[PDB]
Amino acid sequence: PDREKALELAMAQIDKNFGKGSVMRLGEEVRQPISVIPTGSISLDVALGIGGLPRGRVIEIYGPESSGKTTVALHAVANAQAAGGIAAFIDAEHALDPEYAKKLGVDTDSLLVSQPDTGEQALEIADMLVRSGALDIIVIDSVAALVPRAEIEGEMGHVGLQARLMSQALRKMTGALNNSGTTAIFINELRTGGKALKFYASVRLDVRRIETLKDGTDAVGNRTRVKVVKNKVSPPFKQAEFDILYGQGISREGSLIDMGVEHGFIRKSGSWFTYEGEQLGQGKENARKFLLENTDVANEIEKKIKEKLG
Ligand SMILES: Nc1ncnc2c1ncn2[C@@H]1O[C@H](COP(=O)(O)OP(=O)(O)OP(O)(O)=S)[C@@H](O)[C@H]1O
Ligand SMILES: [Cl-]
């Protein structure tokens, strides 16, 4: 017996039988792909281990209200579009603020939006789109808002039908999703169908608000924390953090400062961030700004960090 040789032989057959990623060692550092979707969060992009959401996969983003799920998803779309991709937003919440979306860099005008009459119609419309192979990314707002038709329409006290709907739906949309090469983000709100999504998801993000961006003493935004509780394309359980200002989305410069520091590219003498010899400022915010204005800097930092990792 040769354990490691026997185990590898095992794994190999396991992945063959159920797909790559069926099993993997946690420390394992996986081989990156040909063009993921920058989550808009450098840290998260890293936690996902492939620099962003995997295309042609089902992505669930759950968490409480105000935790930043929609924000993240928007950025996802933006990038998808920045890459000349076509986007679709299946809205069953009617909560979208396109003005903010634009600010996150979404081309709202070219963005397709549907506002279904029932959970069925929703997913159906979603299926039909996906399988046109024109969409790079699609978003479904509120797994919960996918209420069956029988219930929306007047129906008696019943079933366990919302889950079945969601289940069957995913069943076919996945095949398509894969052939299409389109990523499907399902925003799930922690306040029914998530039962299925748990198993169909390739990636599952547990998003929640941790801090109240205050800087010194005033409301700015909030610090989010995402845990990749499920990851079928890279070791799971990675966590990342980042800032979302009010009105502004995920602070790229905020991620850059933070990750740049923990990775020694930007030195932080107490109270004063410094990089490569140039002074960046006292207090994250001053640094953030500096990086915001001096777009050349940060870009360097964005490169440097990118390299050392993935
Ligand atoms: N329309 C908006 N205008 C200004 N800031 C917004 C807006 N929407 C979201 N934000 C910012 O993003 C934070 C919340 O992130 P969301 O985009 O709401 O993601 P989320 O909470 O999962 O989505 P919900 O609550 O289902 S909409 C807010 O606290 C603000 O910092
Ligand atoms: Cl990003």
Side-chain angles (χ1 to χ4, degrees), residues 1-4 6-30 32-33 35-155 157 159-190 193-194 196-210 212-214 216 218-245 247-267 270-281 283 285-291 294-302 305 307-310:
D2 188 52
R3 288 205 297 192
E4 286 302 311
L7 181 49
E8 296 297 317
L9 184 57
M11 305 176 94
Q13 184 66 48
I14 281 178
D15 272 29
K16 183 177 183 293
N17 282 112
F18 313 116
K20 298 191 173 185
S22 289
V23 46
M24 64 190 98
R25 295 193 182 66
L26 286 183
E28 178 177 304
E29 256 164 44
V30 176
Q32 331 265 332
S35 296
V36 303
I37 310 198
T39 201
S41 176
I42 308 160
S43 48
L44 174 48
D45 283 306
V46 183
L48 276 149
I50 56 174
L53 308 179
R55 288 186 59 180
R57 290 292 174 274
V58 183
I59 283 65
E60 172 187 4
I61 304 186
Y62 75 70
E65 125 199 71
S66 306
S67 54
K69 301 171 282 90
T70 304
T71 293
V72 179
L74 289 178
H75 273 298
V77 184
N79 298 264
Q81 292 192 310
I86 301 177
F89 190 101
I90 308 304
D91 175 60
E93 284 281 10
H94 315 326
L96 183 52
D97 176 325
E99 274 302 299
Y100 169 78
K102 249 188 291 185
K103 187 156 295 308
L104 296 195
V106 188
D107 162 38
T108 65
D109 281 337
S110 298
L111 172 70
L112 283 67
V113 179
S114 176
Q115 295 183 299
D117 296 334
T118 63
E120 282 83 16
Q121 170 170 126
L123 296 167
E124 263 195 48
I125 294 183
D127 191 69
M128 295 177 58
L129 289 186
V130 172
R131 58 174 77 262
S132 94
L135 303 170
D136 271 40
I137 185 174
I138 197 175
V139 183
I140 290 62
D141 205 317
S142 187
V143 179
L146 302 176
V147 293
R149 178 191 52 63
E151 185 187 312
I152 289 172
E153 292 183 348
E155 273 187 56
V159 279
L161 177 54
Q162 197 177 122
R164 269 208 300 288
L165 150 69
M166 191 68 214
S167 283
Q168 296 170 287
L170 289 171
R171 183 176 179 181
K172 56 183 292 186
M173 189 182 298
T174 35
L177 269 163
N178 179 67
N179 314 311
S180 54
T182 319
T183 300
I185 298 184
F186 281 100
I187 296 184
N188 190 20
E189 184 103 337
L190 295 200
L197 206 63
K198 193 177 203 178
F199 286 104
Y200 277 107
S202 301
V203 177
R204 300 188 74 222
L205 303 195
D206 175 312
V207 191
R208 65 174 141 223
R209 204 141 92 158
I210 64 178
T212 183
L213 280 212
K214 196 169 117 98
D218 44 341
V220 188
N222 318 70
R223 181 162 263 272
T224 291
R225 175 184 299 160
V226 178
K227 182 155 175 270
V228 201
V229 306
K230 185 177 180 176
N231 191 329
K232 282 300 207 104
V233 294
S234 157
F237 315 127
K238 301 281 184 54
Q239 283 185 46
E241 281 180 23
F242 56 74
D243 292 341
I244 306 180
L245 292 192
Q248 319 169 62
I250 297 174
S251 181
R252 168 171 179 279
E253 302 59 40
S255 285
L256 287 164
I257 293 174
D258 293 319
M259 277 200 82
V261 177
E262 75 177 61
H263 284 52
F265 287 82
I266 168 190
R267 297 288 182 182
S271 292
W272 275 81
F273 297 104
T274 69
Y275 168 58
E276 213 64 339
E278 305 166 77
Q279 196 167 237
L280 269 43
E285 278 312 324
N286 289 272
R288 205 199 301 281
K289 290 183 180 177
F290 179 83
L291 270 60
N294 276 106
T295 69
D296 273 28
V297 190
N299 259 279
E300 197 178 0
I301 308 183
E302 210 219 303
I305 303 182
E307 315 195 294
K308 193 203 166 210
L309 293 55

